[PDB]
Amino acid sequence: DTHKSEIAHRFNDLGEKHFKGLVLVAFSQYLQQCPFEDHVKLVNEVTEFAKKCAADESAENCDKSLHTLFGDKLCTVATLRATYGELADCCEKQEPERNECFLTHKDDHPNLPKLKPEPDAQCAAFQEDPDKFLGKYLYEVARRHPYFYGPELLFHAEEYKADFTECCPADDKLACLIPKLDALKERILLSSAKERLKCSSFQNFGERAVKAWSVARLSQKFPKADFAEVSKIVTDLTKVHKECCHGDLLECADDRADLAKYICEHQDSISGKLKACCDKPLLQKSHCIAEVKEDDLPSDLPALAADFAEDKEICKHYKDAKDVFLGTFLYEYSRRHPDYSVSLLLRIAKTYEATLEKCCAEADPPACYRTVFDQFTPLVEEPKSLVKKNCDLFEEVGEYDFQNALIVRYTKKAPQVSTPTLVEIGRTLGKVGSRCCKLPESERLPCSENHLALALNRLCVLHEKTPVSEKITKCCTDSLAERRPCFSALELDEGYVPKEFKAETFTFHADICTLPEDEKQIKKQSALAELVKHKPKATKEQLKTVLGNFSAFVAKCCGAEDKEACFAEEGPKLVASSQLALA
């Protein structure tokens, strides 16, 4: 009665509310186009089956694996071949082939309506049926983010509830909601980006990469913990993210809860910053641990030169246990460098490995590997200069212009990429500056590079969907640690052919005057990308000037009596003269 029914076990432990939540998320992520009602009935059916099994675990089919049961359920969906031309071919297969097929078919750019707040109608729908309202939130977010961290989404759904709980009762109801919903959306976009990076590391580089990344990060966050505790947490967390990215949202949640329990049981040994996190409820606790502030450096951190540089038997220790020795190094170097980005630590660790590989084949390895730490100095200075440079730009020109700079920089790197994707990436990269440049200067490098990694991964995911550029492919697939430097190193692609001019691309009309500011920016930034594509060798200062002229023209005509006549008269001349400005 314990080995028998996995679905009963999961139902019992997780409980009905979370069980149904996670199954809704999983179904919304696998079948992103189906209507809400379809998914709700699937969820209810599955829950019913779980409760029957919980009664009699020896009943028929209660023995079957979670994947088999979820996959079967997905395969009983109305109009599958019509809605999803491919996922039905997946339904011909058994597990685990079927699940791999499903995962293959997930869509990272489903191209759905933007989630626009409607305070009146939303509060109404929230009041008449809260469960249906929060379920809809889960569904809408889950399908817009098919790799979103399942329990994390349940946590955000609870924050969404709290927003509507405090705001709907009175007043504008929109001046209460809109800023809170805007903050929630930014947290959603961030959270998705982090989880997608973890899943992408699994997909593209494997579990050893995910472990290394986790070792680095957790060592930084918990420098007091010893290598055994870090290793344990990393093994557990890796398994957690493996199951979540693999689709096992139930295993995902259950192992995530166990890990939080363990961490809070050993918080004294792990970190002083976990106190607050451990006093909170389940979901909130996991959240808090995931985002916990880094603990203060221990006063008894060991000197590393003696064991990792000066020791004469390093080649023996390395040849004996490559993985273990390298892991120890990474733990030790990371815990004492919260001022480094995770990817920087991974590069340093690769350099350490490469130095040992080289030195241990030569006559006198000792004298060779004695200056290993000194090989880290260039790797450190490069990103520090970049961050310093870009923050100097950000603080001079502000987000918009900084974004414009990045949109130019990346369009020259990859002019074959679609204007929407370039705009999206450029704007995300620009937001990095707003997030990181204001922080204490010690935190600017880690903040900047870690968020850059998220944005570049987003670009790499879109590029997997729609491959256009071999340079992007190489940078996206060669080395996870080297991705940001690889991208930074790209110059203008001179094999590119300037896109043939099309006046309507740069032609504006009065409609733009009604848009909110950000959608107006996006229109202008799209034009900018198109300018670069047409004139790849134009300097960023030329493009900045031309875009200024375009911006001024838009502002004038939007303020005009006959806005449309203003556009009709002015636009064509600006369009013609721009070409000449961009030679």
Contacting residues toward Na ion, per CB under 5 A: 205-206, 208-209, 419
Selection from Na ion, Cu ion, none that 449 binds (CB < 5 to 8 A by kind) is: none
Selection from Na ion, Cu ion, none that 311 binds (CB < 5 to 8 A by kind) is: Cu ion
Residue nearest Cu ion (C-beta atom): 3
248 is in an annotated binding site: yes
| Stretch touching Cu ion by CB under 5 A, among 209-217, 323-331, 337-345, 559-567 | 559-567
Selection from Na ion, Cu ion, none that 419 binds (CB < 5 to 8 A by kind) is: Na ion
Pair 264, 224: CB distance under 8 Å: no
Virtual torsion, Cα 444, 455, 238, 447, nearest 10 deg: 10
- Rounded distance, CA 70 to CA 77, Å? 12
**Which residues inside 269-298 make contact with Cu ion, applying CB under 5 A?**
287
3-state secondary structure at position 253: helix
| Stretch touching Cu ion by CB under 5 A, among 271-279, 303-311, 367-375, 451-459 | 303-311
Which candidate, 476, 433, 223, 451, places its Cα nearest to that of 343? 451
Q: Which DSSP helix (H) or strand (E) runs through 411?
A: helix 377-413
Cβ 299 to Cu ion, closest distance in Å? 25
Question: Residue from 208, 509, 537, 556 that binds Cu ion (CB under 5 A)?
Answer: 509
Cβ 209 to Na ion, closest distance in Å? 4
| Cβ nearer to Na ion, comparing 177 with 245 | 245
| Cβ nearer to Cu ion, comparing 270 with 315 | 315
- Rounded distance, CA 402 to CA 394, Å? 6
Q: Considering the rule CB under 5 A, would residue 504 count as an interface residue with Cu ion? A: no
Which candidate, 315, 396, 416, 411, places its Cα nearest to that of 357? 315
For residue 421, give both structure tokens. 């994707």
- Rounded distance, CA 491 to CA 381, Å? 20
Cβ 509 to Cu ion, closest distance in Å? 4
Which candidate, 77, 16, 12, places its Cα nearest to that of 42? 77
| Stretch touching Cu ion by CB under 5 A, among 21-29, 116-124, 276-284, 311-319 | 311-319
Which candidate, 97, 168, 68, 154, places its Cα nearest to that of 126? 168
Cβ 205 to Na ion, closest distance in Å? 4
Pair 201, 210: CB distance under 8 Å: yes
Q: Which DSSP helix (H) or strand (E) runs through 530?
A: helix 517-534
For residue 260, give both structure tokens. 């939080």
Selection from Na ion, Cu ion, none that 266 binds (CB < 5 to 8 A by kind) is: none
For residue 86, give both structure tokens. 């491919």
Q: Considering the rule CB under 5 A, would residue 242 count as an interface residue with Cu ion? A: no
| Cβ nearer to Cu ion, comparing 192 with 220 | 192
Q: Considering the rule CB under 5 A, would residue 248 count as an interface residue with Cu ion? A: yes
Pair 314, 308: CB distance under 8 Å: yes
What is the CB neighbour count within 10 angstroms for residue 189? 15
Cβ 65 to Cu ion, closest distance in Å? 8
| Cβ nearer to Na ion, comparing 315 with 417 | 417
Cβ 150 to Cu ion, closest distance in Å? 12
452-479 in b/e burial notation, b at 16+ Cβ within 10 A? Answer: bbbbbbbbbbbbbeeeebebbeebbeeb
251 is in an annotated binding site: yes
108 is in an annotated binding site: no
Chain residues binding Cu ion by CB under 5 A are 1-4, 13, 246, 248, 287, 311, 313, 509, 567-568
List binding-site positions. 3, 6, 13, 67, 243, 246, 248, 251, 254, 258
List binding-site positions for Ca(2+). 6, 13, 243, 248, 251, 254, 258
List binding-site positions for Zn(2+). 67, 246, 248
